[PDB]
Write a protein that binds this ligand. Structure first.
Ligand SMILES: [Cu+2]
Ligand SMILES: [Cu+2]
Lengths: 620, 620
């Protein structure tokens, strides 16, 4: 009966029925997004009304709509017509990916470009990439996708090994017409194949790896109730799933003695953008928001036991809607398990003669998604000591291009004639804080060096300083690794036994943020990625750092607009948005399939407890 | 027969015999340090001549000596008298530790200070801390230790919970004289106990943790031959142990096809210092060089199966010398095992229909040491993909003090009246590089942002630059996380199939470096800690960033002096010295025993291989 329970296949089927009956789901309509709405602030309203938010696309060219329906009452709460040229286009439909390659296949300009390169059109795959917004005036209001070509020699061939550079096309997926085909010149299509399962490339497989058996003879230490409510080593939370954000953690709390203390109300990766840094007109427009434009949850993989998740795994199989409102189950799309995490605490004391050692553990909640050539793993970790951590694992096949004769300052060579354009993978973690309640505040903590002199005659002293962020206008912060800068979220009304406000400290990896020029389209559309940390006043409609309709939006939506309200965040219901990412200069080692690389962040208790919260852990 | 084999009990006894025969080890002598000497560069002697280096202390006050002997030929190669007042005192002897408390127990000044605080001398433990170099003229040429007091209420009581602030004494451990007793005033001695094994504090132990079983039915995948030669998943290396540095990795190489390719000739933590930032006269002199002054290997813990090292573990039991030259085994002092490391590579390709997933693994070589209140774990990891990583784990009990009534800018409060002085844990990793051989060079790589304009009209382009460090004078580098700065060690004479010099990229955590004022004693003595990266030309006698004798030694030796030679490091036999550490502002959560915190670095291949080196990893 939990208001945070996962959507059922029936609920999605009910939304479909409601929409159809209301006349909002005709033959020309398509569901571009469908997700359950979280309970509003204030559970005073007995029995929560299960509501779903829906983005309805019209393949006829008619205006799309944002609809809210109550599955509890079987009614349409609201239906608003959208002006895409103003507020942005709806997310890309899976069924739209195909149209790009199919439409180009009969376009004379495209066929001529391929003929010149002696490429069989039946062997040319086309990657359907988001368009963004640039100098093409005829695109505003129009739903466009840009296509880049790759040759697939045979059904099981990895097309990524054969990019067709010097060629790009733009297509209007609704009017179904190729608006433009640009051919800047022929580039040799890389010849070597990148088939990592081909013995000629892998060579003899290793026979040196002995098995590692990870088991739990008495089962897991965590309990799953209500389908998605998790309880593990004092932790309490609800694992939700949204087609846009993927796995979302709700009501993260820690049982400290006799009371369940909240830490974070909602944690999610609210956006993920991959900006490319190759100035070639063939790719200079390339920026794909996996979350905002494509909806990462939608492409979550079914995780195979023993391969994707090892040990004693408890799966969750979330259900999403297809383009027509039919429920589709993502079998084993979410993995949950606990794993040993080395030494937790250790000390051999000479004076007391007591030797003490305790092991650590982490609760893991994860899912893996595939976006064309890339595959991303999203992992949330809960540690015994109260630490919360997120880790993104980037793998898959690198997006390729030709490697220019004479080299390049924006592309690396991975194989003969094969290039890999420089790019970044930048995430935004939206953390709706609730440190011992909703009355929170954020402080920027910097290490402070001291000069040798009076009060510090030996010049050994060093300190720290904390600055409270009181208004949103001063809540857009940058990292400063040199000064060990961190951010503390505390509750000025809840103090520990030492009369100090309880808190949690966010430790960032301090990786580079968005590198693009400040005046670029991407810097405007993904402004969140230009700064490491943002703090906003909580608001029901401020869900994504990039706004609700990212696709082809002119820019400034999301965080820049929210922050413009300059609201009070000093001891209020606030939300922390942390930007973190990888800057990728592909290596030869990343080809033909790249080894996982990682990035993340974590929050550790900072005077939240009255002493170590793991003194009750057994020797085992 | 391997010249990189661990020292045997026999060799140590032989050294003792040689020294005795040479008249260098009479009853007044003590071995302060003893270690095997690594073989010199180039195949010198027809066979392998085993040599040991020893620092001989004299308990009567006579000048100590540095001696090198050949255990094979039974001769003293060299023996030099040391002028400690100039070049430094020898490492602290374990037997000198107790001298401090013993001598103070009968000193009138000390007794009066304790009486003024109503403390029973029989219950006052004294921490024997390194003295360093300050303004005390009488200390020149004397082996001094400074003592700080802690009250131990009973045999199994954690004295750290009861610091006696406002009091410190200096002691000459050779002449057995208390040179000074400083009392700046009485401070209340914190009353609360910090006994983490007392049920009154731990409360009932958790019964919610279910067992996690990690086993290897067919045994480990790595082989150990010649006692310490490891071969695992293409990696090859020798695990050495030195009483000063602890675990040292030799000849790290990777089998790429038919050739064994060297990567790192020698890897070790050449120094680690813990500088305190409390300006109080009671502790403003506190800086302990665990490695250089105390010799961390000496205090390596015997690691218990299931507790310290979980899974299928293979142990090494290194042997060291005791103060008299007798061999002493550190039973199970080194743990070696492989562990699963999640997903290695993964891609679900729509076009080819091929779904691919491979898991990762890492080889772990570690040891754990105890220095008074702190306990440090040293971990070296080797991954399937060629990555090499080091991780230090800091735990134990925080060093305490009283917490001043009016608060403090250099101490945090852990409990009523109990303080924890701010401090840092800074390590120095000495990496004698050998990327495909000894002809190496280092390049500093920074991300390069580009301005929007001609050639980059959309302002999306970004690049990078590499600067070769050609001379030691330009090889003292700082971190720059904002620009994603890394350092690449390459071999300009060994190129991959794409005609690019093979290399490895060092990824630092970019944590703050030494915070002390540049004019402080510690900034001079721990000069290496002020910069993130140093590159020197290899030399037989340049072993530690702080020189051979750190104890009570001024600046003048170590890295700053090595760099002054301004030698050519562009395509030469070079050594990388990486500084990395933790800046600790103790939290209430760190008391009464602190949960592990970590810091480290890693090196990933950068065009070292011609493609991913893990394509031959099997599915299962
Ligand atoms: Cu990438
Ligand atoms: Cu510390």
């Amino acid at each position: 009966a939990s208001p945070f329970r996962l959507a059922s296949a029936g609920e999605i089927s009910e939304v479909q029925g409601i929409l159809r009956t209301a006349g909002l789901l005709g033959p020309e309509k398509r569901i571009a997004y469908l997700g359950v709405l979280d309970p509003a602030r204030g559970a005073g309203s007995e029995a929560e009304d299960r509501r779903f938010r829906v983005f309805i696309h019209d393949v006829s060219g008619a205006r799309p709509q944002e609809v809210t329906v109550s599955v509890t009452n079987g009614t349409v709460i609201s239906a608003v017509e959208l002006d895409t040229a103003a507020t942005g286009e709806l997310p890309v439909l899976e069924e739209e990916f195909e149209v790009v390659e199919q439409l180009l296949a009969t376009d004379e300009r495209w066929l001529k470009a391929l003929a010149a390169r002696n490429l069989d059109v039946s062997k040319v795959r086309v990657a359907p990439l988001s368009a963004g917004v640039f100098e093409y005036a005829e695109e505003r209001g129009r739903r466009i996708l840009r296509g880049l070509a790759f040759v697939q020699d045979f059904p099981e061939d990895s097309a990524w090994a054969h990019p067709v550079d010097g060629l790009v096309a733009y297509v209007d997926v609704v009017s179904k017409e190729v608006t433009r085909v640009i051919d800047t010149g022929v580039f040799p299509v890389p010849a070597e194949h990148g088939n990592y399962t081909d013995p000629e490339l892998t060579g003899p497989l290793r026979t040196t790896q002995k098995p590692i058996s990870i088991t739990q003879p008495e089962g897991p230490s965590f309990t799953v109730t209500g389908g998605n409510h998790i309880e593990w080593e004092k932790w309490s939370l609800d694992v939700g799933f949204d087609v846009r954000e993927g796995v979302v953690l709700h009501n993260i709390a820690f049982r400290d003695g006799d009371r369940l203390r909240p830490i974070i109300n909602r944690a999610s990766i609210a956006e993920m953008v991959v900006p490319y840094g190759d100035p070639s007109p063939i790719r200079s427009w390339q920026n794909y928001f996996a979350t905002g434009e494509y909806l990462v949850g939608q492409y979550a993989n079914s995780l195979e036991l023993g391969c994707d998740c090892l040990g004693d795994i408890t799966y969750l199989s979330p259900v999403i809607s297809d383009a027509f409102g039919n429920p589709r189950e993502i079998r084993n799309g979410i993995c949950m398990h606990e794993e040993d995490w080395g030494i937790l605490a250790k000390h051999s004391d000479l004076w007391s003669g007591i030797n003490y050692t305790r092991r650590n553990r982490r609760m893991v909640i994860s899912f893996f998604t595939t976006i064309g050539n890339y595959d991303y793993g999203f992992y949330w970790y809960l540690y015994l000591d109260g630490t919360i951590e997120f880790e993104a694992k980037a793998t898959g096949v690198v997006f390729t291009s030709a490697f220019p004769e004479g080299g390049s300052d924006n592309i690396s060579q991975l194989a003969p004639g094969l290039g890999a354009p420089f790019h970044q993978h930048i995430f935004s973690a939206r953390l709706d804080m609730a440190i011992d309640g909703f009355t929170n505040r954020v402080e920027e903590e910097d290490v402070v060096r001291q000069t040798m002199g009076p009060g510090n005659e030996r010049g050994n002293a060093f300190s720290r300083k904390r600055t409270v962020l009181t208004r949103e206008s001063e809540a857009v912060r940058e990292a400063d690794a040199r000064t060990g800068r961190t951010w503390i979220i505390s509750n000025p009304e809840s103090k520990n036994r030492l009369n100090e406000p309880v808190g949690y400290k966010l430790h960032a990896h301090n990786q580079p943020t968005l590198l693009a020029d400040p005046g670029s389209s991407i810097a405007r559309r993904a402004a969140f990625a230009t700064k490491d940390l943002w703090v906003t006043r909580y608001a029901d409609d401020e869900r994504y750092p990039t706004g609700d309709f990212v696709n082809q939006h002119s820019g400034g939506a999301g965080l820049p607009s929210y922050i413009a309200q300059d609201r009070d965040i000093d001891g209020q219901d606030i939300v922390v948005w942390h930007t973190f990412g990888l800057t990728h200069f592909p290596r030869v080692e990343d080809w033909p399939i790249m080894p996982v690389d990682t990035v993340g962040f974590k929050l550790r208790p900072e005077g939240f407890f009255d002493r170590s919260p793991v003194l009750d852990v057994p020797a085992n």
